């Protein structure tokens with residue numbers, strides 16, 4: 001029966017804003033959820049949102065006939081450069097539905113067979129970089145994983161090589177995109193957006209859009225000119241027609257999808273690999289068990305697709321890192337119609353909800369009371385996890401289109417890492433989670449000792 005929604009203390013016209021004075025708002029909101037429970041309202045001047053934390057309420061939120069994906073303010077600023085790509089489109093936009101129908105078969109578990117060789121290509125480069133470090137040296141984990149995922153997505157996405165392992169300063173495209181992403185995030189905390197002190201920012205953001213558009217438009221035009229087929233997504237987008245309308249994507253939209261895959265894919269996948277390595281080095285017994293499987297399964301100089309599929313425990317490791325620290329930590333929904341949530345909380349059409357995924361993943365009625373512990377064995381039998389309890393890829397038709405890709409990629413790379421090196425948390429690293437569009441273990445570093453096992457040929 002109808003309840004008032006909990007809300008943290010408001011401070012006059014500042015409302016709840018003083019409780020979020022932080023560059024780590026997700027982490028700050030988990031602490032409010034621990035105080036207030038499965039649902040709370042959070043008010044800033046001019047904005048209201050509800051934060052959901054329990055599997056019980058999230059399962060309702062995930063009903064697509066009642067709620068649909070909302071573009072949060074972050075996603076609307078990212079739309080300045082990612083346009084109506086899949087990630088920053090409303091569900092009702094014709095290009096959302098066209099791209100979705102055209103691209104889905106290109107992201108399935110089956111489609112992974114055709115990307116695997118390109119993924120091995122960048123994965124071998126990463127292993128060789130680490131084999132070639134001298135004794136005195138260490139690895140900057142998120143930085144190398146970001147080099148890996150950007151290059152993998154560039155190769156599989158549109159057969160372009162950013163050659164990140166050949167560079168101290170990334171390819172201009174990558175500098176621009178990271179900077180554009182950075183600016184989108186900085187605009188959120190921007191008190192007075194139109195003050196002249198942000199004129200250089202605006203100009204730089206415009207310059208970064210042109211850089212990104214120019215490269216991608218040039219590669220699209222070059223592939224149409226050359227007319228040749230690759231195993232890449234760009235080939236699928238140029239030949240693909242929506243079975244609903246029978247129409248292909250236009251060139252501009254194809255550009256946006258390409259910028260989208262890179263922008264949406266690379267940082268979350270990078271974060272996942274970094275957190276996985278974090279948890280392994282902090283849990284040596286889990287590390288040994290994963291390394292044992294890697295040694296037993298990956299008996300070839302390079303992994304085949306079928307071998308990657310056999311790495312069950314590595315898969316469990318990844319899921320358990322996603323349970324604790326899902327690298328896209330929140331997603332936003334609006335009420336399609338007036339509705340009552342959980343039998344107690346009335347909502348009007350348009351009202352916004354945010355799913356706080358790390359807090360969902362600590363629901364003790366689902367996971368047990370030990371929710372903070374890293375235990376991959378939670379995932380030994382995935383069919384036994386209750387529906388909507390584990391949501392690191394979002395929900396329904398607006399769920400992560402890259403989920404198979406990200407998992408295949410992380411499994412492959414992690415298995416290769418576990419196979420070829422021993423690791424040492426030589427600084428006793430204290431976890432520091434930076435928040436942007438995604439989560440990542442900032443400043444995470446390790447030493448790898450090579451097991452001297454020969455590689456790909």
Ligand code: HEM
Pocket residue numbers: 069086087088100153260261262264265266268269270272326327328330331332392393394395397398399400401402403405406
């Ligand atoms: C560990 C890696 C990843 C995680 C945790 C992650 C998470 C997510 C989440 C939570 C969403 C839903 C966002 C929302 O509701 O607003 C999403 C959507 C999306 N993701 Fe991922 N992602 C990952 C990797 C990737 C990769 C590798 C790609 C592409 C190569 C990708 C492409 C996309 C796209 C295009 C969408 C929009 C789908 C749509 O709305 O139709 N993601 N992802």
